[PDB]
């Protein structure tokens, strides 16, 4: 492809800055919109103590040994289920 | 503006190589020397800053074997394989 | 290659001492552990 624009006389700083502010940062701002939109809590599913999940062959080396490193009580159940 | 150039800011050996290249000279051996005809009257002239330097002779184009020998200050020496003549031209930089 | 004669010649006798002492340095510690395996094995 060629995407759908033009220039190519030279590739100098002016061009790449034109692309930074005219294409790249706008896209980031559109994706930031779209995300800060589909964000906010989706509903936690019923806990089922599946044996292929919540693995523990050895206690983790921090906390009480049973919590993952970025444990989020809202959405990460422990092997025996979601926390108090 | 606001970014130094090499002309303004390069220093030490890097500046030395840059200035010399400007004058078309090669005190740091970046370039490969071109062979003379290699006869007794037209020997390859081998600069050095001492009174001997190791030469490697690639006798024929594409040989993979290089022939290595110390060239000493004095009468021209010949490659022990093809006899092309070499002569040391000592001292300086 | 050619070389010079030894600066510090090592006589047959001195080579015997160097060899004997070399072999003992390998054989003795190991021989001591293995000789005592039994007391290790069962203690």
């Amino acid at each position: 492809a060629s995407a759908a624009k033009g220039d190519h006389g030279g590739t100098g700083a002016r061009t790449w800055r034109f692309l930074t502010f005219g294409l790249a940062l706008p896209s980031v701002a559109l994706c930031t919109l779209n995300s800060w939109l589909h964000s906010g809590h989706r509903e936690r599913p019923a806990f089922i103590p599946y044996h292929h999940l919540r693995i523990r062959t050895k206690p983790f080396s921090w906390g009480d040994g049973n919590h993952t490193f970025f444990h989020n009580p809202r959405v990460n159940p422990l092997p025996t289920g979601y926390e108090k | 503006g606001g970014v130094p150039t090499d002309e303004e800011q390069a220093t030490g050996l890097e500046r030395e190589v840059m200035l010399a290249a400007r004058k078309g000279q090669d005190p740091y051996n970046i370039l490969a020397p071109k062979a003379t005809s290699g006869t007794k009257e037209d020997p390859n002239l081998v600069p050095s800053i001492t009174n001997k330097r190791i030469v490697g002779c690639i006798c024929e184009e594409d040989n993979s074997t290089v022939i290595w020998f110390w060239l000493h200050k004095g009468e021209a020496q010949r490659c022990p394989s093809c006899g092309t003549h070499y002569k040391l031209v000592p001292h300086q930089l | 290659i050619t070389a010079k004669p030894a600066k510090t010649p090592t006589s047959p006798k001195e080579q015997a001492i160097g060899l004997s002492v070399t072999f003992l340095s390998f054989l003795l510690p190991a021989g001591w552990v293995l000789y005592h395996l039994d007391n290790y094995k069962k203690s």
Partner: protein, 259 residues
């Protein structure tokens, strides 16, 4: 006195301190994992940071301040950097391999399907797409930086490099937040294992690449780069593109195709 263009380096203690630091960080992870103590590890992390700090300081002394980087030196360092990035690519390769192996033939324990039963993947169109555009944007703003530097423009070099850094940072913050929000964890079988380990080593590289861009920002502030000689900047721009490209493969493989 030499008459070649190569750099004879002064005897240095950083190779030994770097090695001892690797021993203290490995011994230290062992002690953390099995003997419930973090002390050796914290010592090894500290000597490691001091070693990298002084070693790279000294490379800056040798080049910017002492002029040892002749073209032939600089050409070697370009090779060193390409080769290093090649070896990081192969390292990511073994993790992509792991991921395709488990996802392509999901075993009975997972339900015989991918994603496993009980796994609810992130939507690749929400924060993962946003991360994707952040890192693609940062590859455009760093190319602007690089052209500014070559055209001798100090101020636009600094503004583009700053924008590039802020985007690295934003990616890192987005990803930390996603890690906290994700309903699956590293212990959720081979799905959380492949997800967190692959994307986690990528995040570590984004942190390292961002640190290197920040070293470049401060060296540029101090006028170290010329419009023609700026290897540290080039190397950090290659590494940065390497980080963006590994993200694109992770996004396509893990977030989009593995969802």
């Amino acid at each position: 006195h030499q008459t070649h263009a190569y750099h004879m380096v002064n005897p240095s203690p950083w190779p030994l301190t770097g090695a001892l630091s690797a021993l203290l960080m490995t011994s230290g992870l062992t002690m953390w994992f099995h003997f419930n103590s973090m002390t050796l590890l914290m010592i090894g992390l500290t000597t490691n940071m001091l070693t990298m700090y002084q070693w790279w300081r000294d490379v800056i002394r040798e080049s910017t301040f002492q002029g040892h980087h002749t073209p032939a030196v600089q050409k070697g360092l370009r090779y060193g950097m390409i080769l290093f990035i090649i070896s990081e690519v192969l390292f990511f390769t073994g993790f992509f391999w792991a991921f395709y192996h488990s996802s392509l033939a999901p075993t009975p324990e997972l339900g015989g399907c991918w994603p496993p039963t009980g796994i609810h993947p992130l939507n690749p169109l929400e924060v993962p797409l946003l991360n994707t555009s952040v890192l693609l944007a940062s590859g455009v703003s760093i190319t602007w930086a690089h052209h500014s530097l070559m055209e001798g423009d100090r101020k636009h070099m600094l503004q583009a490099l700053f924008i590039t850094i802020t985007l690295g940072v934003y990616f890192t913050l987005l990803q930390a937040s996603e890690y906290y929000e994700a309903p699956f964890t590293i212990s959720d079988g081979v799905y959380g294992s492949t997800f967190f380990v692959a994307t986690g080593f990528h995040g570590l590289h984004v942190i390292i690449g961002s640190t290197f861009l920040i070293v470049c920002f401060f060296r540029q502030l101090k006028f170290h780069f010329t419009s023609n000689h700026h290897f540290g900047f080039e190397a950090a721009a290659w590494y940065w593109h390497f980080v963006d490209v590994v993200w694109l493969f992770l996004y396509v493989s893990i977030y989009w195709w593995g969802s």
